[PDB]
Amino acid sequence: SSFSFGGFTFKRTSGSSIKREEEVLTGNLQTLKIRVHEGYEEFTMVGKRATAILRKATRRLVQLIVSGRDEQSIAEAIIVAMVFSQEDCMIKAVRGNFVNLNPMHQLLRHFQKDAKVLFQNWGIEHIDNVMGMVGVLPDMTPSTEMSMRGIRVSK
């Protein structure tokens, strides 16, 4: 019922997903055969320096409420969460850029080396402050009115 990904312990708290094979095309026109998970699911991500709740749908991050102890702790959490989403956005953030050995792990290893194109192409939004949380910009700078799409930073 538990698994591990990118140094974070994932534990599904709700929802279901079925598997289906899909051929995607990274930003560098490289073909990858990923197993796409269909359905809405919620997860706990537990790490040594960061924790998060992650709601996702089929190839879409619905929301990520993350807390951490520093900027790189939140950055690692967000990187893992966005690679886990399986979003076409993230697949296309492979820019430049071939990846050498799981496709999902290839993407994580790639985006762990640097998430600039990743963050920079994810998308930003206005926060309504209805959760009393803080937003995070593509550069990991805090903000009180804007945040990367679906990402919220708690304490």
Ligand SMILES: COP(=O)(OC)c1cnc(N[C@H]2[C@H]3CC[C@H](CC3)[C@@H]2C(=O)O)nc1-c1c[nH]c2ncc(F)cc12
């Ligand atoms: C019962 O299996 P699960 O469906 O539910 C817990 C489930 C299991 N293992 C895993 N393990 C995976 C994850 C991610 C990549 C590897 C590293 C950890 C590993 C693998 O794919 O082989 N993932 C899920 C899973 C549920 N939803 C998902 N959405 C997207 C997604 F990339 C995965 C998943």
